């Protein structure tokens, strides 16, 4: 008897605090006023009219169920539900060195973003009349691995600044991506502590002048705000956070992270420490294969990419069949039967690694590796449509996403891959030219076999319904201007199209013979 936190542990070097009034807690009042487990006022031994005591902000431990108030730590599941609301956060720090000892101050903060904010050591200090948020002495940690920290003591910046810079750097990174934040962290304790500086909490609130729930708070004038519509807002209103390590990994963060991802080399800097936390987060989550029960609402124009995507597929897989007349088409990566050109004489064989259960009688269960299968499909044509892999086989029609492009749709991942979210977030390997060694790029073209039916335009490339003439034929002249639009779009969605080399625009005209 008895146990203690210490949260708010007194870090001052004063022996003998504290008068029974101006003593925060019974626990600390000088032995001198204590008797029989009580305290008593002795006018003889006065209260000090001047003192400064550093109160430790470490050990925050918040789990409480209060009806109007949101759990700020979320389940792995609910965390997936919001992905890239995700941000990696790891704070490096410094210890209080002179007028006091025994606590940790937030020296440098870093993020999944490249950003590193450094702050002047500051802490919470008890005086006679109040608590006061104030600059403090500090020193860098002992380790030789912490030597990179030394100069940052001078570097800046006041906390009143830093919590403002934080909210913007967050505001503009999350504005179009999400309605909330989730901080993704490896050793959560210190970062929770760091949070006390910028983060205010409370029951859900709708942003001033907007429909959407509030991200930010400004003390300058009591208000709440929104990811987009905040500015000069100092505090974050209801962040969420997930501790990755709580999923029971074996070692230190870099140990596990590096098992999977080789693209992030470590320089002990906070950012880099907080990036490696997202990787693991992403890998241990989305490189398991493509769970389809998870629905990510779209903003925006995923639909116009979605349609424009199928449209282009059908067009080229129809043509490619006409052109070289393949006996069989090997469709690799088709969970559901779903012939893309529904009417073709061709044997249509399906292969996928995770075939949807109904429609599993139609499909062979298969995992394609060029090492193993470069032999195994010779006859006919192979279709890899957003089935990303070990380098593609010589006879193939493929669509691979190029990770390098950025859009609010696609997020960073491991290792160098990107997690792509349209619906059912799709993690894709990083773009590798070696994949395409056997293929060649797909030049743009149009094909329509039909009867013909605002200003007309001639196109060197469309094998067209009617080319005897110009021939702008008002029905295809419209459709070709529409299918080139939706093709120009999916290209800017980052996607690329790669075909077997033999393929020739020409052979499509011989289907016009009779």
């Amino acid at each position: 008897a008895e146990n203690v936190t210490g949260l708010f542990k007194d870090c001052s070097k004063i022996i003998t605090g504290l008068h029974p009034t101006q003593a925060p807690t019974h626990l600390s009042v000088d032995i001198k006023f204590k008797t029989e487990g009580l305290c008593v006022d002795i006018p003889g031994i006065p209260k000090d009219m001047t003192y400064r005591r550093l109160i430790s902000m470490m050990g925050f431990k918040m789990n409480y169920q209060v009806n109007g108030y949101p759990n700020m730590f979320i389940t792995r599941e609910e965390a997936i539900r919001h992905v890239r609301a995700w941000i990696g956060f790891d704070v490096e720090g410094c210890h209080a060195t002179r007028d006091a000892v025994g606590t940790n101050l937030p020296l440098q903060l870093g993020f999944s973003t490249g950003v590193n904010l450094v702050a002047v050591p500051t802490g919470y200090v008890d005086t006679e009349n109040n608590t006061e948020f104030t600059r403090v002495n500090a020193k860098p940690p002992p380790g030789d691995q912490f030597k990179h920290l030394i100069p940052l003591m001078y570097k800046g910046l006041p906390w009143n600044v830093v919590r403002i810079k934080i909210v913007q750097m967050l505001s503009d990174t999350l504005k179009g991506l999400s309605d909330r934040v989730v901080f993704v962290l490896w050793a959560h304790g210190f970062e929770l502590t760091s949070m006390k500086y910028f983060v205010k909490i409370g029951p859900e609130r709708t942003c001033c002048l907007c429909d959407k729930r509030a991200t930010c708070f400004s003390t300058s004038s009591d208000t709440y705000a929104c990811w987009n519509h905040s500015v000069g807002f100092d505090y974050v209103y209801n962040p969420f956070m997930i501790d990755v390590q709580q999923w029971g990994f074996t070692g230190n963060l870099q140990s596990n992270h590096d098992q999977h991802c080789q693209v992030h080399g470590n320089a002990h800097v906070a950012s880099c420490d907080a990036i490696m936390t997202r990787c693991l987060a992403v890998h241990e989550c989305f490189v398991k294969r493509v769970d389809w029960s998870v629905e990510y609402p779209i903003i925006g124009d995923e639909l116009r990419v979605n349609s424009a995507c199928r449209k282009v597929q059908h067009m080229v897989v129809k043509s490619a069949l006409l052109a070289d007349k393949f006996p069989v088409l090997h469709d690799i990566g088709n969970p559901k039967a779903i012939k893309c050109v529904p009417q073709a004489e061709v044997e249509w064989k399906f292969y996928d690694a995770q075939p949807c259960s109904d429609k599993a009688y139609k499909i062979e269960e298969l995992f394609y590796s060029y090492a193993t299968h470069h032999d195994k499909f010779t006859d006919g044509v192979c279709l890899f449509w957003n089935c990303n892999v070990d380098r593609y086989p010589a006879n193939a029609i493929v669509c691979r996403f190029d990770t390098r492009v950025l859009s609010n749709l696609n997020l960073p991942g491991c290792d160098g891959g990107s997690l792509y979210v349209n619906k059912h977030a799709f993690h894709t390997p990083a773009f590798d030219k070696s994949a395409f060694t056997n293929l060649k790029q797909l030049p743009f073209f149009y094909y329509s076999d039909s009867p013909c039916e605002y200003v007309p335009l001639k196109s060197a490339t469309c094998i067209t319904r009617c080319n005897l003439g110009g021939a702008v034929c008002r029905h295809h002249a419209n459709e070709y201007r529409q299918y080139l639009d939706a093709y120009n779009m999916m290209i800017s969605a980052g996607f690329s199209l790669w075909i077997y080399k033999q393929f020739d625009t020409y052979n499509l005209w011989n289907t016009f013979t009779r």
Partner: protein
Amino acid sequence: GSAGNATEVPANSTVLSFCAFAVDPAKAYKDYLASGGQPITNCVKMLCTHTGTGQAITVTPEANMDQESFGGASCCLYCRCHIDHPNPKGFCDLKGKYVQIPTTCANDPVGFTLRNTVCTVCGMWKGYGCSCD
């Protein structure tokens, strides 16, 4: 490294963490009480003659057979959670004075300081009680 001197006991951990973070500390507390959660304990409690004025804010403990007595700043929520004080600048009511509470109401001293306010007439509790008004 500890390496330091401990101010607080665990049974107040969650409760304090809450209001430290909250935008409105007052609400957060009253609510935590609603949710069925335990009130802040560990306040400095005064061994007293129990004869004296009934007044709430005094420079030395003054109690009634009705009241029990507390070192003020442990009964202060803002003082206890180490966050800014509701007075605009900057200062506390209860730090450096003793606060009095009715023995029945005494279970939740931190709260009682929020819930009520002192008559500027008799310097005594309003309703718990006061002769004025």
